[PDB]
Amino acid sequence: HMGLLSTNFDMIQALPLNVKQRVCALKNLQMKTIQIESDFYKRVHELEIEFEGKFKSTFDQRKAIVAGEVEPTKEQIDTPILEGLEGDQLAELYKAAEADPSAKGIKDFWLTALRTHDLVAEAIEEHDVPILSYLTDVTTAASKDPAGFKIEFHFATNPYFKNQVLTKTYLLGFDPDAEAPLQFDGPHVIRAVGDTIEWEDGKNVTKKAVTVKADSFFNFFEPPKSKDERNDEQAEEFLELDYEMGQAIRDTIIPRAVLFYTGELQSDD
Amino acid sequence: LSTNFDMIQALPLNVKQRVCALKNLQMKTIQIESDFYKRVHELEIEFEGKFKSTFDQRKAIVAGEVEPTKEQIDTPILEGLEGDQLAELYKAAEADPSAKGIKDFWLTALRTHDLVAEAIEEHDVPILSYLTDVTTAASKDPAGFKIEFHFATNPYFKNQVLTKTYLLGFDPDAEAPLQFDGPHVIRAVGDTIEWEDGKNVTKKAVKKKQKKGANAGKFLTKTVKADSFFNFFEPPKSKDERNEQAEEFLELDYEMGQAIRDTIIPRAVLFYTGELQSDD
Amino acid sequence: GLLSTNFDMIQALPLNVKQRVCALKNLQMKTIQIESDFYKRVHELEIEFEGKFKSTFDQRKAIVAGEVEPTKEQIDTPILQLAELYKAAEADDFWLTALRTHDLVAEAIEEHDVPILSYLTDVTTAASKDPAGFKIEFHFATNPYFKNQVLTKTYLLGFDPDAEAPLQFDGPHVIRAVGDTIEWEDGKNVTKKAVKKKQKFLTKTVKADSFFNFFEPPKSKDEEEFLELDYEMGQAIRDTIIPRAVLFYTGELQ
Amino acid sequence: LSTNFDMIQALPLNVKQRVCALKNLQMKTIQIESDFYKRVHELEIEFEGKFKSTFDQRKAIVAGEVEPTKEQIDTPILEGLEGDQLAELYKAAEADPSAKGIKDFWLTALRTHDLVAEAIEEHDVPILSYLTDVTTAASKDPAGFKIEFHFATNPYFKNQVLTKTYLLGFDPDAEAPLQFDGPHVIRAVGDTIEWEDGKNVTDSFFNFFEPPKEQAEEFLELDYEMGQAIRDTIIPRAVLFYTGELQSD
Amino acid sequence: AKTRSSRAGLQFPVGRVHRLLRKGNYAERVGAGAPVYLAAVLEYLTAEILELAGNAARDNKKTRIIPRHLQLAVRNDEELNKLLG
């Protein structure tokens, strides 16, 4: 929160000017230390881009398993479906339901994973659920040239829209702002760019029937703007929450999708 | 912690084997994450030198070894103040020449952080007033990091520097392979405080009753652990070392060390002024 | 303990007599150790006599399995009117009947265990010295319920007084019991049963009543009367049923 | 009468001859068991000497002939008592030099055992107060055991020791071999008490030395059980009955 | 100690309770008094359950409160059973 109302404000008020000016020097060096951190975060972003290819293979296999394209191996089968289960309990769970050959792959896998995460769950409304049942994969990739990252929602052939993939892009800034140089917590978002959904007829859940904007998860592809039309701080708050949800999908859900499917993970950590 | 458990129960064994296969693939992703975190650690070790200059200048200013420059003076002590308030704050106290440096600087910074604040007791305050600097550095070959509390010549102990090292593992735990969130702690190594006479605040004596003993219904004097911040240099033994409610204390020890290394040391003055308060 | 029937007397004894009583307790401990050695010797005697009983028990196994035919003297032994009883049926499950005749074992034998126990070719017992204990082997035949040729239940026993309760020695006690792993086939595990819960209904396999739970013994130190009852059933099989098996078959013992 | 009687009758009787063969083998097993019990009897006789030292030390301590040792003193008088209660109990009475050892030790031990308690009458208590020792020993050719009640100089009878012997059979019956459960009792032989004048209490416990040798066989069996209780339970753990911490049959 | 929770006599984390209340998006703003109150109430419930479960551990001659001890303590106390059951 910073500013005044600083926990140790009365102390700094009582400090003689001698130390009051020394504290000012420490603030100046703190600004320099913040700048070094920004360079660090740029390096970490490049490191994420480097490892994208290393993670790609495992995520592609997950997509294959979810889509029923490939079958599990013996080693994969001898993996506990839920961690922390005794052999007796594991046997009970495996023998609690009989195999249905009709069910090809995991159904509603990404829908369930997204709705198990609290932040994303608050965005999913009832009319978006059947649409999200078609989510075959959710992928992310980070760029350095326009400084940002993207999240791609790969859908199947659905009676709601013709788009095969819906893309959400975030352009991010790694340098601290001059207004609040000491309030640097990592890369911030400069802007967000959504997608245009080729909705079928009468299926656009983002629009109400009163035509006015409705509440839907797919508004995620209609992000707020930074160079808005002056015809509005709520837009900035909306953009920050949109960025937070994008980070939740990119950094937490996609890396550990099954743990959200199994529900063994929640938003914290 | 198996949210959506009834669903997993209702899944046909056919889909259950696919979910377990996904868990195996999650283990593979975790291994790649472990390699990522190893690289990130090397990056921090690389940036140690870049941070050194600013941290050393801070240490010099706090100890009164150097005086602020014009650019340093024209930096607002409290960011976000109105000018009519900044001028009043500067003119609210007159300069005292006796005060050489910033006293209790590291004491104030450590006590403003919530987690560390819960560890500092009042009898620990005068000892922590001798804290000239707090530095941290990371190792790759033993795979860990250290926090060094530089003390001055004090009537509490003869130790010139109190060092706390954490040996941490970057590979997923065999116990909880899917619960990998980054490097975990293998064990923690404290220091031996050359306490003077009657100054050991980490240990006390209690006249307890060993009547709950062995053919001895008598009361005896026992040396019991006393509540102090310097018990930080007597870390909880790891699983291998000595053998409930000890892994939790060790994890809190690791959390406090991480708070000092990642949060307080990089932004110490922000905790001194209290403009930033983190918890965990 | 302090609730000793003659506690007021023991307190009323002068320190002079009380220290002498303490001496008697020490000598009692020595006597307890001598008894421990005695029981060890009796166990060694049982192991020695195992071989003496072995030949007769092997002949029993051969006769029960139809491997050998009886001799004239064997015919001339009363089965329990003799002519009427012998001539009552025209010519052409030993352990099942024998075990179900013993009351304690019978309470463990349920209906679904009867066809399984119809495969019992032999039941044998033997005692060990270095791993101080004994074992019971239920030798089964080729059965459509499990692949086990023999199901073994072992009891590890302690012949030395406990240091916690040194004066409470009553003979060898049971330290722990080790069962066996039954290679139950599919739908043949009589120790388990199915049940469901409200909502496709979710099936929940649950514990069932069977004699073969005898081969799933209670644990000793893991996180007690059940273990003692398991030991009692094992003692009944080893000491009473196996030595006089036909006497339980004929019903000549109550 | 046989529980599984219908089984033998409904049996095709071809295998019934096999059952008869098993009956013969059971007779053989019964004989082997008889030899086993004989060996156990020899083992008890062998262990008599091992128990002798401790039992004689008990006799000396009870009679005040010897004094307790430092190790002997540092044994809790009652098991399961902590240091507080143990010290308090020791501090409940002061040492009386007018007591020669344990008084009525064997009387108390015998009367704490349930079966023996039912035999002890009121007039037998002062007589049994002279019991220095109760010992037992087993024989092989007489095939049995004996219990000797060693008495002191008493104004009730001149017998120094009253002996009760049980002659036992370890061999299976030839007529009915299959009802063998171990050594049985053949007979019991008491002693002749040289009572003084007006002291013959014979309802009394000392009728135990006048053995009987449906109700008479029951008398012999209960007499044998009392003898076994004295031999196997009371004598081995006499002090446990003295303190009353053990009451068994 | 010197913590926000030490300024109310409580041994539960006032700061952590505040953070959880804000992070849970229960409302738009939360004052300082609500974390103090909530942490105090949770500390009281923890203390009462621990008291009953440790008394039960004593009645079972155990220095470690096993979960069965908490179960017996909860069932025996009618109010605790109404709250937790």
Binding site: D268 | - | - | - | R7, Y26, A34, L42, T46, E51
Partner: protein, 89 residues
């Protein structure tokens, strides 16, 4: 979340030399978290009937009374009020 350290402090305060298992401590953590969730949810509901959705000691108090049964509720309210009093002092 985990209140294990604080639960342990409370345990040593109430019973000095008793201890708690790790599974019992998990049961205690679930108790504390469940009560937290119920009290916070009720506070949120009672704050919807307020302006700008601010949660003070009032909403927590009302939730405590509406959830905690009988004597427990009374004692909880007492200690909450005491704590807010000292925190303000």
């Amino acid at each position: 979340e985990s209140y294990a350290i604080y639960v342990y402090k409370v345990l040593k305060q109430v019973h000095p030399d008793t201890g708690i298992s790790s599974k019992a401590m998990s049961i205690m953590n679930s108790f504390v978290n469940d009560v937290f969730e119920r009290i916070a949810g009720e506070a949120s509901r009672l704050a919807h009937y307020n302006k700008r959705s601010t949660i003070t000691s009032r909403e927590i108090q009302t939730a405590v009374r509406l959830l905690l049964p009988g004597e427990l509720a009374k004692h909880a309210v007492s200690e909450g009020t005491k704590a807010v009093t000292k925190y303000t002092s």
